[PDB]
Design a binder for this molecule. Structure first.
Ligand SMILES: O=C1Nc2ccc(Cl)cc2[C@@](C#CC2CC2)(C(F)(F)F)O1
Ligand SMILES: [Ca+2]
Ligand SMILES: [Ca+2]
Lengths: 540, 410
RNA sequence: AGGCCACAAUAACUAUAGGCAUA
DNA sequence: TATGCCTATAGTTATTGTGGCC
């Protein structure tokens, strides 16, 4: 009475009518012996010229799976060992007769038909069809889990003190009871599964507490990954770097200090499978220190619902952040490596907030509650940025912690114009033909300077003009520009390699005492702005 | 019972479930178990590929958790049923009233059975913490809250029960949208509360079960320009930049005489006296901002758009339009007074208030343009959300010029 | 006669909204 | 109206890799 699940096909196609491959005879003699045993057990049944559908046997259901209907996800996101609870005794159960115990929908059974190769030149042959769930089928793990969940329900209600997790065929059972009480309850679970015809290993055949699951070596009190050993010195190829990044990203969940950006910069190149990309001194520098991190063995800690979650942020470099989540000090649950400056530039404060937002969402999936943050930023700086910024955000609980690399807001522009300060009207113009541009400034005192540039755009020339306006000016400066682009960048705090010019302007503004910056509409006949525009667009 | 079919070509809703907190999931399990025993929803297997997002909200009167299902995706695929086949009529006299009271009648749809073949499209999944359990699956057996077809089917039974109320009060206007009921009246403060209860007591006859609006008080506040005694170059330059951008909204605005005040290079502090032409241009520009602009009309064939800007210090401004620079309704939602308010809460309170105003005047939910990140909004919006509707939103960038213009609005 | 799940990197298609420049 | 050059918001399909599985 294992309750069959009704399964249909996709709207506009019948089952696979694919023919068999040439006979071998070396494999046929073995296949008959296996199929007869499956027929005797009741897994498959004989059919004649009735069934038009056919499936090739190596059984490859590649054509049928495309024709079979879509099933809802079995398990999309995999459980993280940090989200699991600490248990006294743990037991795993490898289920035999998994897909064999659960029967298939009778009407669908005709689509799973397969024909055995002949003995001597296309002789009639023997035909079979699956009465139960077949291996390598789309709906096989979906129905099996759905059937298993209904079986475990009465046991879960009777035993809420114990925790049972189901994965594919294997079952993970854990409790806080003594080793004597725990061992007895597993046998009671086995007898319940044996009712439906599910074979499970006995006490002596059961695996010991070091479980290997999804690459993780699990323990009742702690968890660790399998030792990561990588090929070393000699000049490696392009995909060997991709294999190295894959191992470092895999280690980033437990090892806190991992830097992978320089290897990602080498993979920014395209094409050849054997390019043999050499290393830069800065690339091997972060690679050599990552070897030191992977030397000493580390372990993760399980989640406790009583204690609060605490996350800490550190700025390790240019567009790189590292976080470690812990309930107890020095006892880390999970680490990360967030460095997602998406090829852009951004800043320091917003980029930190983008880091916080990723962990907040991560904690909802894993633990189910929001963690308390300890950020390397003062409340004075946080309030100043988010009041002047257009984008809204909210971090409910966060505290201040002084770390060696503090997040620092460099400069702030004046809200009102400065008295006695020299006024600088500024403008830049360029043409995309030949790529020539001019940048200049005109003051109220009379002084002016115009320069010419090579390989430049309108965005670069306007940015060069303000650089000249800060180069020749005093301490208190009033700068007027007609660009929304040039105003928008300086009003933000670009903490990146936004190319040469931007880093020079930021460095200039730190040296100055007070700077006021204003915007005017272009080509409107405004005094000051009109005089500069005629000079920069003289030959353009 | 009534047969329901999808729009030809399109399949059912297949949307990913957004992760929920440990407290919210346990609250949803308690509600879903109650509804399963009542015969509202039933468990279904993995053979159903269709999915609908589910969120947990909180109420004020009930004080307990409420189940919210996001049918936004499915409603786009079943739009021919509740708009063309069974459309709800909308009057143009609801927007003019003294007092409007809103009531929730969402429990009324929990009795009328749903079509057998259409039951599979209302499937939703309850997520698990760290994916320990496979995830609990359910589908609606009756008319669900948040689905546009529910008021369309009940419409034939809704008009017959409101007939004794409509015949009693001919001058009083009533309108139904989704799970909320809108009643407008020109009666007094003490009269309004009693007449609503008369309809509320009538609901109990059929068996089913500080919030008061003033649509006449939604008068559009005009944009006022700074009244200054002495003008400087910097004061003109900020004004010209804002007015030149506003020329595409209000065509009557000109900056020609104000620009002639700036002759040659001048300091920002330099005091410029206003001439006969400059004063007369600025004064007429103030008159254009006070009087409503021509060429602004509602179009039923086009979708409505709503854009909100953050001004800071607990101030938010908004615009309702169908085409850019042509606003049908403007204003500013400052803050819900004092207590506990953040950037998300003030925005959440604004969106709900703008949506409610959109239903009274037009009867359609606008496309929301929000100055917030997608990941930030989708996590915290459920905390302060109360209404059953779900407006279609997008996340965009806020220009500096549009932010500085609408803060001059009174 | 490799596919599926999680994460990451590279590439490509970007789409929408606003803006500047030239035509 | 087109293309090149800027900002912001949001995605999609392919490859490769790491950890796993059928
Ligand atoms: O809540 C947890 N605690 C736990 C702790 C250690 C181990 Cl090794 C296993 C668990 C467990 C889980 C497991 C599935 C991930 C494999 C257990 F399956 F129930 F065992 O449940
Ligand atoms: Ca454009
Ligand atoms: Ca792969």
């Amino acid at each position: 009475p294992i309750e069959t699940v009704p399964v249909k096909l996709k709207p506009g196609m019948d089952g696979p009518k694919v023919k068999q491959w040439p006979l071998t005879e070396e494999k046929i003699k073995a296949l008959v012996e296996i199929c007869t045993e499956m027929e005797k057990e009741g897994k498959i049944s004989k059919i004649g010229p009735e069934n038009p559908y056919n499936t090739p046997v190596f059984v490859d259901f590649r054509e049928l799976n495309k024709k079979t209907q879509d099933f809802w996800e079995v398990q999309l996101g995999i459980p993280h060992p940090a989200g699991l609870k600490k248990k006294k005794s743990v037991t795993v159960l490898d289920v035999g007769d998994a897909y064999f115990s659960v029967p298939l929908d009778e009407d669908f059974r005709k689509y799973t038909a397969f024909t055995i190769p002949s003995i001597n030149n296309e002789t009639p042959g023997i035909r079979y069809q699956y009465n139960v769930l077949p291996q390598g089928w789309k709906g096989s793990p979906a129905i099996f889990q759905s059937s298993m969940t209904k079986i475990l329900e009465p046991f879960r209600k009777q035993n809420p003190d114990i925790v049972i997790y189901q994965y594919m065929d294997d079952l993970y059972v854990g409790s806080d009871l003594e080793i004597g009480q725990h061992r007895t309850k597993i046998e009671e679970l086995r007898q319940h599964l044996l009712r439906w015809g599910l074979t499970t290993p006995d006490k002596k055949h059961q695996k010991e507490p070091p479980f290997l699951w999804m690459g993780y070596e699990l323990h009742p009190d702690k968890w660790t990954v399998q030792p990561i050993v990588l090929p070393e010195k000699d000049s490696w190829t392009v995909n060997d770097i991709q294999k190295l990044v894959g191992k470092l990203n895999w280690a980033s969940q437990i090892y806190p200090g991992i830097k992978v950006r320089q290897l990602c910069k080498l993979l920014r190149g395209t094409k050849a499978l054997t390019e043999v990309i050499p290393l830069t001194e800065e690339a091997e520098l972060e690679l050599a220190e990552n070897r030191e991190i992977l030397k000493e063995p580390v372990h993760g800690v399980y989640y406790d619902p009583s204690k609060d979650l605490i996350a800490e942020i550190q700025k390790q470099g240019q567009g790189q952040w590292t976080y470690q989540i812990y309930q107890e000090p020095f006892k880390n649950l999970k680490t990360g490596k967030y460095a997602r400056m998406r090829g852009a530039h951004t800043n320091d404060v917003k980029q930190l907030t983008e880091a916080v937002q990723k962990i907040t969402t991560e904690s909802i999936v894993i633990w189910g509650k929001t963690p308390k943050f300890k950020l390397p930023i003062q409340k004075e700086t946080w309030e100043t940025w988010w009041t002047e910024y257009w984008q809204a955000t909210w971090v409910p609980e966060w505290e201040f912690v002084n770390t060696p690399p503090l997040v620092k807001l460099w400069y702030q522009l004046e809200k009102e114009p400065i008295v006695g300060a020299e006024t600088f009207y500024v403008d830049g113009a360029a043409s995309r033909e030949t790529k020539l541009g001019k940048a200049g400034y005109v003051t109220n005192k009379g002084r002016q300077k115009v320069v010419t540039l090579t390989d430049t755009t309108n965005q670069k020339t306007e940015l060069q003009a303000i650089h000249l306006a800060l180069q020749d000016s005093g301490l208190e400066v009033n700068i007027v520009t007609d660009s929304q682009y040039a105003l928008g960048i300086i009003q933000a705090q670009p903490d990146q390699s936004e190319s040469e010019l931007v880093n020079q302007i930021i460095e200039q503004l730190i040296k100055k005492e007070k700077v006021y910056l204003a915007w005017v509409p272009a080509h409107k006949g405004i005094g000051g702005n009109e005089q500069v525009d005629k000079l920069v667009s003289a030959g353009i | 019972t009534v047969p329901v079919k999808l729009k030809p070509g399109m399949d059912g809703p297949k949307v990913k479930q957004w992760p929920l907190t440990e407290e919210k999931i346990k609250a949803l399990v308690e509600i879903c178990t109650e509804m399963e025993k009542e015969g509202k929803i039933s468990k279904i297997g993995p053979e159903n590929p269709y999915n609908t997002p589910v969120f947990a909200i909180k109420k004020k009167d009930g004080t307990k958790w409420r189940k919210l299902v996001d049918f936004r995706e499915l409603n786009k695929k079943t739009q021919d049923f509740w708009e063309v086949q069974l459309g709800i009529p909308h009057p143009a006299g609801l927007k003019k009233k003294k007092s409007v009271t809103v009531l929730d009648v969402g429990d009324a749809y929990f009795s009328v059975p749903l079509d057998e073949d259409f039951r599979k499209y209302t499937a939703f999944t309850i997520p698990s913490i760290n994916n320990e359990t496979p995830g609990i699956r359910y589908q609606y057996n009756v008319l669900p809250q948040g689905w546009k077809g529910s008021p369309a089917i009940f419409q034939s039974s809704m008009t017959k029960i409101l007939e004794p109320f409509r015949k009693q009060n001919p001058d009083i206007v009533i309108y139904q949208y989704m799970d909320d009921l809108y009643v407008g009246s020109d009666l007094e403060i003490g009269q309004h509360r009693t007449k609503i209860e008369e309809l509320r007591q009538h609901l109990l006859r059929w068996g089913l079960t500080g919030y008061e609006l003033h649509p006449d008080k939604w008068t559009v506040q005009p944009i006022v320009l700074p009244e200054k005694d002495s003008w400087t170059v910097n004061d003109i330059q900020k004004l010209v930049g804002k007015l030149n951008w506003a020329s595409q909204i209000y065509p009557g605005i000109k900056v020609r005489q104000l620009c002639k005040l700036l002759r040659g290079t001048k300091a920002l502090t330099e005091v410029i006296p206003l001439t006969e032409e400059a004063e007369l241009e600025l004064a007429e520009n103030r008159e254009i901002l006070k009087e409503p602009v021509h060429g602004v009309y509602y179009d039923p064939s086009k979708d409505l758009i709503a854009e909100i800007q953050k001004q800071g210090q607990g101030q938010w401004t908004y615009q309702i339009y169908q085409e850019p620079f042509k606003n049908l309704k403007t204003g500013k939602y400052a803050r819900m007074r004092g207590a506990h308010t953040n950037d998300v809460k003030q925005l959440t309170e604004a969106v709900q208030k703008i949506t409610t105003e959109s239903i009274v005047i037009w009867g359609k939910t606008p496309k929301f343009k929000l100055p917030i990140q997608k990941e930030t909004w989708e996590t915290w919006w459920t905390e302060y959300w109360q209404a059953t509707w779900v407006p279609e939103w997008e996340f965009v960038n806020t220009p500096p010029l549009v932010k500085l213009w609408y803060q001059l609005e009174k």
